[PDB]
Design a protein around this nucleic acid. Structure first.
Lengths: 140, 600, 493, 471
RNA sequence: UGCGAAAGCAGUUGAAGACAAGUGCUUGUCGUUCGUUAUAAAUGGCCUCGUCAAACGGUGGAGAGAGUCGCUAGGUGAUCGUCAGAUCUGCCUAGUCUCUAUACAGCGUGUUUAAUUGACAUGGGUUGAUGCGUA
């Protein structure tokens, strides 16, 4: 019927010019998706590091939430959006350590990252089989 | 739960009546109305000195005092704030007796003196209630008469309980309806209990019962939430209203050691099923539902401390766990000085969490059945072992194994009878005393395999064994409840590769990840650096132990040059792990014209 | 015997940011019409009565839009200078308007030609003119003179009461329901002043400090009043005279605010708030005023309005922009001889002793893949999985059902390269998704173990494997990364 | 059931019967009724017969009769599967029957694991008896001794079709645990879905947890929420404990793994669904199926017994209390607190009573002679039951042999007071008692392998009147 | 088969008797016994009671579809070619941007936490089956 399916890993209820920090802070505060999307369109890693560097630690946490939801809904953005996530953890790591709760607020990341990794053993099994057949007819 | 230090409210005057410390409490009366959880004021009647009101916080101070002649003793005193014909007023009602010849009932009205009235009481006034709503003052007399007066002390109604020599009268309210009960001694240790309802007559008797075996001379009585508490000869008797029926008797051994006559005891309730008990200068907070001592405090600077009254929390409804109680403290010295003191009390959460392991009350395997189906003397052992000569291994092993009929040098399910802990501890003590140096008996090897190895001997157990190689691997593998700190110190101090893997396997198996992470934070930075170098030179349990290390070290501590070497090793391992996994999966996994030679 | 169970559609564990019942209602305002006006549309109001036409004030004219037609039906252009209000009375018969000259004009709604009453409220601009909700005769006016006069329709020569005490422009006026004597006004002082008309008046009974210029004050309920000013809106309780909640989710300064209750939405009550940042967002008063939906427009929003509770037809959401654009979003709502011969169908047995019902309710028609599985057509059911215009979720179920039935090889025996490519084509795209990755691994494994020889002699099948090996290899990188970010995320905690 | 019309060789069908048709017969002077015997081959432990009397006119069940349908851990007595075209898990081939019979007799005699214990539940609000049949629950009324419902609680090929030949090797989801909240308005079910064989994903079992609701008047449980892979991937839920009335007014539960992890779920009104409120990390690398869980009535403390070690964890912090740890001689089978003061802990070699107030064991009774390797981990828990007022019961079953073990069994019930000081009663029953549990009244119900639920508890007118009735 | 965790760790799958077929010999079988913890395949697949249209209430979504040479990051091809690059004003993938009946899937609206109505004579006969539409 209309029951909700869920999982046990859902811990929800438990330097340089060109930086877009000004736009990013406004977009996150007002939850303006369109304004946020333009910020995420920048792909120059030098820009990404600097913007997160100047971004206020309080706003960094909600940025991680926004990226996690975008990555979970769209798998094709998993690559380009990860560098945002990786830089957020590197720069604001000290702030993230000193937070009363992480699982409830970062529940979206834990679920999304957990899902992909659980497929890892199966994909290796498929890859080995595909190599076995790919090797066979290539030599023949 | 906890007990705060007492802080002084006032110094009692040096009056002859108050000089008798055993009877000192009876001469000081506490107003019920002014003393509760939310009131910052306390009204007190000191016999022969005055009736005083004090403010408790921020600092104790005297706010009002009414002098009384020194020959008078205050038998009952109450104070309540209310509106009287409308002005906000504070009504003070107190009764005195003068050499037993005349008895005075007095009401004083103060503006928040507006009026003062005085009448002659028939018998000693024991309990006084002020009903500010109806503008009434109700007095209970020792001769059984309950007299209702106005604020002008005009008699409105008089009710007789048909019993004299009344000894106990306490007030309580239930569901907004006002009730009172009283206890009247009878002969042959009998006691008439009557419950009265206050509403043509304003007093209605609801129950009347006679209680047998209820003595007063050595009984301390107090009431809380429909239950009556009677301490007698170290036993607390539980009577439940409205019939005052005995429910429970609680044994308190700490009072059974008290010689009769010298030990000063007071009793008061502080919350639901929680009371305050005092023995001379020691204060006990007790939970009677679970029979546990929540807290204990000794007042070394005072000879005795007697509880007078306590502000009681209704913990079932109140989120506040902090309250206050009042008592009289008597100092040590040739000229003892009595002082009134206040103690702040944390009752707790009224949960079994609070009472666990704090009981104030101080084995042999038994066949399940007393008596054609398919089957699937410790002290003497200790005495024999102790009598041996020192360093006599063969005899010590012979007596232990033969007499207990043990066959193996390691514990088996058939040795369940030997699991008595006291016997094992004594044997361990003998093994330590009887043997030292490099030679220990085979009994130690058996004990190391015993699941109930005492926790007391686990500490330094590895340290005692640092001589003999074989005794480690028995201890590491099987010895129970070995401390984590010692294992971690041995983990980073030992170079033997085999012990490292076994120690790593033991640590992870028996300890949680978070518990291990905290300890490694204590370990020196050089030791962890040495461990990391060991790596760069079953493996997952060693690597998973490494991943715990990097978490303990943190970002700040780790050094870049070593990080480069560690990174290269891991990348090589990841490539190898990827390579092996591919192998593992592999293990699991007509022409139109043809030219042929015919076989003929 | 039991009826055949229906094939259950596969539902993976919930992902973040699911659609909420509140969102599903507000997405239905789909049809959008963008009208251009001469100047900024300062105020928008809805007729309280059927058909609930709404009036928009822009430049020097007031226009009434038909609800059903969504087009102008009346025009009030008699005003010489700028207009500043078009509020209807509770009866909906009259609409009042203020003017920069300060004159207040009362026209008969739907009859622009006739002017019933003309009041010269002040020499300064009269920005707010609102009819009293409970009492029909008295009309309230607030002007830049900073005095909010209470006029009476019968006596237009002198104000009935002249409230004062505001040290700045008063541009907000509100009447509290169930409290006809009370009147609430908010000035750019940052103070919300409440007045009692029963008493002598002219001095507020008390003031509530908002700390920013107040742009609009609305009384959501008899005891709760919500005021929007500066960059946030705060809800005050009069009985306690303190702010219960405050939401500053907006970026620019909130300008307009409207409240609708007891309408057919899942949310009993809604609070729409303009932002001046292009955003108009919905808040739920039942849930501590939490955001539940939002729209974005081209430019700053000055006025927002929603159809009253008893709209009785298609609902409307209206947004007013400073550029002069008006955005409208709408949620749309034989022979007698033969009959005498056949006249018993209408009867439902109301007068009979025993009523007997055995008709089985109609089940929804089953899809082609379900019918094939029910008839044990394993191979055909596989074909129906890979057909053009087939839902991705529905394709996963038939693959999961066939596996659950134990028919994976059974469906794959009688196949060649011509009929194998549709499965491989889906596998090429299905491997990417997390939900279908596990199912793709099993099915791809079987076809390889079952068609190794055919793969050698078929070049087209090989190429499907080369690109597939590329894609699975790409998934390995994504899954490996997710382990690394997971690994470092453990370091932080 | 197929009606072959022999005149034209046609046929009519009555499919989706509850079980395979052992026997079929036409019962009536005019063939009014059809009598059928159904087998329910899903339960391998026992042969579950159901007698179905159908009305031939419309082929509707005129009368369906069956007794209790428990699922024992292992096959009992001389139960043998029916004959099929192939030898499968649910059937026997032509050749395999005799060898299977011999193997079964040899297993019952020679082997030492003789566990037939079955899981059963009691509905508090209604006192109906819930039997977790494989992939379904049979709701049975023991006051009336009649079945009241049979509901499918899992996905799978359960009544979509009739499995034949290789399809008969498929394993439907198994309902391992089934429990009720103290209030009785919520049902918690734990399921294991077995993948089909000969695939890449043929070794990865799926663990599911489900929360169902129904009003008292209704008779069918409605699934409200579904958790796929609780506690992680391929990690079972060994133990389930519904919460006491004190915490969340009985709308919570704990699930415990074989890795030592605990998860506390509760019903959140705002979300309207069950969500994971609290979590404990099963990070350490120790595995054991011997997990037991108890909760104090107040709700302050929770007793978690993993392998040989018992822990007292506070509910508020969901961690060890700040002695909390208790070591035991062998693995813990069941932990139960008869009263808040007394905690009764059963290990594989003995049973003990301990005072939490004193932290000292009062009484210890030997169990090794009777329970050495007879039962698998956790089943002694469904053997031992406790009242919340009077006391607990120990059930001990023995094979009877005269001059090598024989099939027949004898069961002994022992009533124990709180702390096990005295044996209030001692009774003997003549059959293997699979499960004994405490009805919410004082009486205790117990189930026999013979499917028998016993209870242990405290003139001219007169002549004309006769003749007229005769006529 | 035993133990265990689910991963796995150890250990098995023998002898006799009878029958059929082929040529005393060979193989295969067992509604035969003793002992040990111990491929399939007789063309053979699941009933009927009422359908269709339009709504409404929750539950999910990879959204169902069409544009925009508007941006961002990639992959890559035809021909020529002074290897720098040209014409195809190249193609494809992903994100972003614009739009629509949320357009997509599913359960229910016999009473439920919530949520429905309307149409049909549920028949018989004739023609077309080279049906009808589309390239």
């Amino acid at each position: 019927g209309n029951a909700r399916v869920t999982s046990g890993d859902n811990f929800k209820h438990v330097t340089t010019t060109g930086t877009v920090t000004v736009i990013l802070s406004q977009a996150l505060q007002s939850n303006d998706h369109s304004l946020l999307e333009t910020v995420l369109n920048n792909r120059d890693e030098r820009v990404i590091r600097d913007t997160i560097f100047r971004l206020k630690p309080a706003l960094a946490v909600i940025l991680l939430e926004r990226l996690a939801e975008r990555i979970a809904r769209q798998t094709h953005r998993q690559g380009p959006l990860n560098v945002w996530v990786k830089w957020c953890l590197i720069i604001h790591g000290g702030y993230l350590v000193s937070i009363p709760n992480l699982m409830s607020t970062l529940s979206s990341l834990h679920s999304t990252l957990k899902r992909r990794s659980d497929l890892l053993p199966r994909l290796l099994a498929l890859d080995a089989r595909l190599d076995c057949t790919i090797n066979k007819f290539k030599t023949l | 739960p906890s007990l705060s230090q007492p802080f002084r409210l006032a110094t009692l005057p040096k009056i002859a009546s108050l000089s008798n410390f055993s009877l000192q409490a009876d001469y000081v009366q506490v107003a019920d109305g002014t003393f509760n959880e939310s009131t910052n004021n306390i009204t007190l009647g000191i016999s022969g000195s005055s009736i005083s009101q004090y403010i408790i916080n921020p600092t104790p101070k005297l706010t009002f005092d009414y002098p009384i002649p020194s020959t008078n003793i205050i038998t009952a005193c109450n104070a309540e704030k209310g509106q009287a014909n409308k002005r906000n007023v504070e009504i003070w009602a107190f009764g005195l007796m003068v050499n037993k010849g005349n008895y005075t009932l007095n009401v004083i009205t103060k503006a928040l003196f507006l009026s003062q009235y005085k009448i002659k009481a028939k018998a000693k006034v024991m309990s006084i209630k002020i009903d500010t709503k109806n503008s009434l003052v109700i007095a209970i007399l020792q001769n059984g008469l309950i007299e209702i007066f106005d604020f002008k002390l005009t008699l409105l109604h008089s009710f007789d309980i048909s019993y004299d020599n009344l000894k106990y009268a306490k007030w309580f309210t239930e569901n907004g309806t006002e009730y009172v009960f009283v206890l009247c001694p009878l002969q042959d240790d009998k006691v008439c209990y009557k419950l009265l309802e206050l509403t043509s007559s304003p007093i209605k008797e609801l129950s009347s019962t006679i209680i047998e075996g209820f003595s007063f001379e050595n009984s301390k009585l107090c009431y809380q939430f429909g239950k009556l508490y009677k301490l007698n000869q170290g036993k607390i008797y539980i009577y439940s209203l409205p019939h005052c029926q005995l429910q429970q008797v609680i044994e308190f051994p700490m009072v059974d050691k008290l010689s009769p006559g010298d030990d000063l005891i007071s009793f008061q309730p502080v919350s639901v099923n929680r009371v305050l008990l005092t023995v001379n200068n020691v204060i006990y907070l007790l939970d009677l539902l679970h029979c546990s001592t929540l807290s204990q405090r000794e007042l070394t600077h005072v000879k005795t401390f007697q509880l007078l009254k306590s502000a009681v929390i209704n913990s079932e409804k109140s989120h506040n766990s902090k309250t206050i109680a009042i008592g009289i403290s008597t100092k040590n010295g040739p000229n003892p000085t009595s002082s009134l003191e206040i103690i702040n009390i944390d009752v707790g959460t009224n949960t079994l969490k609070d009472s666990l392991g704090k009981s104030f009350q101080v084995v042999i395997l038994k066949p399940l059945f007393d008596d054609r189906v398919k089957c699937n003397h410790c002290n003497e052992v200790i005495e024999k072992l102790s009598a041996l000569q020192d360093n006599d291994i063969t005899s010590f092993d012979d007596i232990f194994f033969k007499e207990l009929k043990i066959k193996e040098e390691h514990y088996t399910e058939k040795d369940r009878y030997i699991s008595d802990p006291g016997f094992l501890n004594k044997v361990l003590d003998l093994i330590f005393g009887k043997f030292s140096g490099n030679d220990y008996p085979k009994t130690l090897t058996f004990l190391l395999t015993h699941p109930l190895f005492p926790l007391s001997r686990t500490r330094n157990l590895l340290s005692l064994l640092r001589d003999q190689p074989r005794l480690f691997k028995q201890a590491i593998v099987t010895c129970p409840n070995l401390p984590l700190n010692e294992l971690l110190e041995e983990l980073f101090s030992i170079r033997n590769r085999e012990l490292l893997l076994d120690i790593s396997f033991r640590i992870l198996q028996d300890f949680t990840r978070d518990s291990i992470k905290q300890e490694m934070k204590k370990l020196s930075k050089l030791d962890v650096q040495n461990f990391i170098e060991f790596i760069t030179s079953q493996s997952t349990q060693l690597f998973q132990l490494l991943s715990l290390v990097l978490d303990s070290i943190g970002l700040f501590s780790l050094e870049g040059a070593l990080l480069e070497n560690l990174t290269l090793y891991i990348d090589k391992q990841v490539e190898i792990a990827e390579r092996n996994t591919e192998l593992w999966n592999l293990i699991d996994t007509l022409p139109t014209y043809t030219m042929e030679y015919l076989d003929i | 015997s039991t009826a055949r169970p229906r094939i259950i559609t596969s539902k993976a564990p919930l992902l973040p940011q699911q659609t909420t019942p509140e969102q599903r209602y507000w997405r239905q305002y789909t049809s959008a019409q963008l009208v251009k006006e001469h100047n900024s549309v300062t105020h928008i109001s809805f007729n309280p009565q059927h058909p609930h036409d709404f009036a928009v004030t822009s430049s020097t004219r007031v226009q009434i839009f038909s609800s059903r037609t969504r087009q102008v039906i009346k025009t009030f252009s008699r005003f010489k200078d700028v207009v500043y209000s078009a509020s209807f009375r509770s009866d909906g018969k009259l609409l009042c308007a203020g003017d920069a000259t300060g004159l207040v004009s009362v026209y008969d709604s739907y009859n622009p030609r006739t002017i019933l009453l003309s009041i010269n409220a002040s020499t300064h601009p009269t920005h707010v003119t609102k009819f009293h909700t409970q009492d029909n005769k008295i009309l309230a006016t607030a002007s830049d003179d900073r005095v909010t006069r209470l006029w009476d329709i019968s006596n237009a020569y002198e104000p009935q009461l002249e409230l004062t005490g505001a040290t700045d422009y008063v541009r907000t006026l509100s009447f509290i329901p169930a409290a006809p004597h009370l009147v609430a006004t908010g000035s750019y002082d940052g103070l919300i002043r409440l007045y009692d008309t029963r008493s002598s008046g002219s001095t507020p009974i008390y003031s509530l400090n908002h700390d920013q210029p107040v742009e609009n004050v609305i009384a959501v309920s008899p005891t709760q009043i919500v005021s929007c000013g500066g960059n946030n809106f705060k809800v005050w309780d009069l009985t306690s005279n303190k702010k219960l909640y405050e939401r500053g989710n907006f970026n620019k300064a909130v300008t307009c605010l409207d409240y609708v209750e007891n309408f057919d939405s899942p949310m009993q009550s809604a609070l729409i708030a303009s932002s001046l940042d292009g955003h108009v967002k919905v808040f739920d008063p039942l849930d501590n005023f939490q955001v539940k939906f939002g729209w974005k427009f081209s430019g700053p929003v000055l006025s927002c309005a929603v159809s009253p509770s008893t709209a009785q037809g298609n609902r409307h959401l209206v947004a007013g922009l400073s550029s002069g654009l008006l955005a409208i979003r709408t949620k749309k709502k034989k022979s007698n001889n033969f009959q005498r011969m056949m006249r018993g169908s209408e009867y439902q047995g109301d007068q009979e002793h025993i009523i007997h019902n055995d008709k089985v309710r109609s089940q929804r028609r089953m899809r082609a893949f379900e019918r094939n599985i029910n008839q044990f057509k394993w191979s055909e059911a596989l074909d129906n999985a890979f057909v053009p215009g087939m839902a991705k979720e529905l394709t996963l179920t038939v693959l999961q059902e066939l596996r659950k039935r134990g028919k994976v090889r059974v469906a794959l025996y009688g196949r060649d390269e011509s009929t194998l490519e549709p499965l491989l084509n889906w596998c090429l795209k299905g491997i990417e998704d997390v939900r279908s990755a596990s199912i793709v691994a099993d099915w791809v494994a079987v076809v390889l173990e079952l068609y190794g020889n055919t793969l050698e002699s078929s070049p087209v099948l090989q190429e499907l494997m080369i690109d597939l090996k590329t894609k699975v290899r790409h998934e390995i990188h994504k899954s490996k990364e997710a382990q690394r970010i997971e690994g470092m995320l453990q370091l932080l905690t | 059931m197929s009606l072959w019309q022999l005149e034209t060789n046609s046929q009519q069908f009555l499919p989706r019967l509850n079980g395979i048709i052992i026997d079929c017969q036409v019962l009536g002077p005019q063939g009014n009724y059809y009598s059928l015997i159904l087998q329910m081959t899903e339960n391998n432990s026992n042969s579950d017969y159901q007698f179905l009397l159908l009305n031939a006119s419309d082929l509707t069940s005129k009368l369906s009769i069956n007794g209790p349908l428990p699922v024992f851990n292992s096959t009992i007595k001389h139960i043998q599967q029916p004959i099929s075209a192939m030898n499968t898990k649910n059937s026997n081939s032509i050749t395999s029957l005799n060898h299977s019979k011999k193997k079964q007799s040899r297993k019952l005699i020679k082997s030492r694991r003789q566990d037939f214990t079955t899981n059963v539940e009691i509905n508090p609000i209604n006192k109906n008896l819930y039997f977790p049949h494989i992939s379904a629950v049979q709701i049975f009324d023991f006051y009336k001794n009649e079945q009241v419902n049979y509901q499918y609680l899992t996905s799978g090929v359960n009544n979509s079709m009739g499995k034949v030949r290789f399809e008969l090797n498929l394993q439907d989801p198994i309902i391992t645990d089934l429990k009720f909240t103290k209030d009785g308005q919520w049902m918690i079910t734990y399921e294991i879905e077995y993948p089909p064989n000969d695939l890449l994903s043929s070794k990865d079992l799926t663990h599911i947890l489900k929360f169902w609701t129904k009003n008292d008047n209704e008779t069918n449980w409605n699934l409200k929420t579904k958790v796929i892979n609780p506690h992680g991937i391929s990690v079972p839920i060994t133990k389930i404990l519904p919460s006491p009335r004190s915490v969340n007014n009985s709308q919570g539960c704990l699930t415990a793994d074989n890795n030592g992890g605990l998860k506390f779920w509760s019903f959140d009104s705002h979300e309207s669904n069950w969500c994971l409120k609290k979590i404990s990390l099963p990070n350490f690398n120790h595995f054991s199926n011997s997990v037991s869980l108890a909760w104090s009535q107040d709700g302050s403390l929770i007793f978690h017994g993993f392998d040989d070690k018992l822990q007292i964890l506070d509910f508020d912090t969901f961690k060890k209390f700040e002695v909390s740890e208790f070591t035991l001689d062998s693995e813990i089978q069941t932990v139960k607190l008869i009263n808040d003061t007394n905690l009764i802990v059963a290990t594989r070699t003995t049973l003990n009573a301990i005072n939490l107030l004193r932290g000292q064991v009062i009484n210890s009774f030997d169990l090794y002679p009777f329970v050495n390797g007879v039962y698998k981990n956790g089943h002694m828990d469904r053997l031992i039951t406790c009242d919340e007022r009077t006391g607990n019961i120990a059930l001990v079953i023995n094979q009877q042999l005269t001059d090598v073990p024989t099939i027949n069994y004898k069961s002994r019930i022992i009533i124990f007071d709180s702390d096990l000081s005295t044996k209030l009663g001692n009774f003997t029953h003549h059959e293997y008692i699979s499960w004994i549990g405490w009805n919410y009244d004082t009486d205790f119900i117990f189930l026999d392998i013979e499917s028998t639920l016993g209870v242990v508890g405290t003139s001219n007118s007169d002549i004309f009147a006769e003749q007229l009735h005769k006529l």
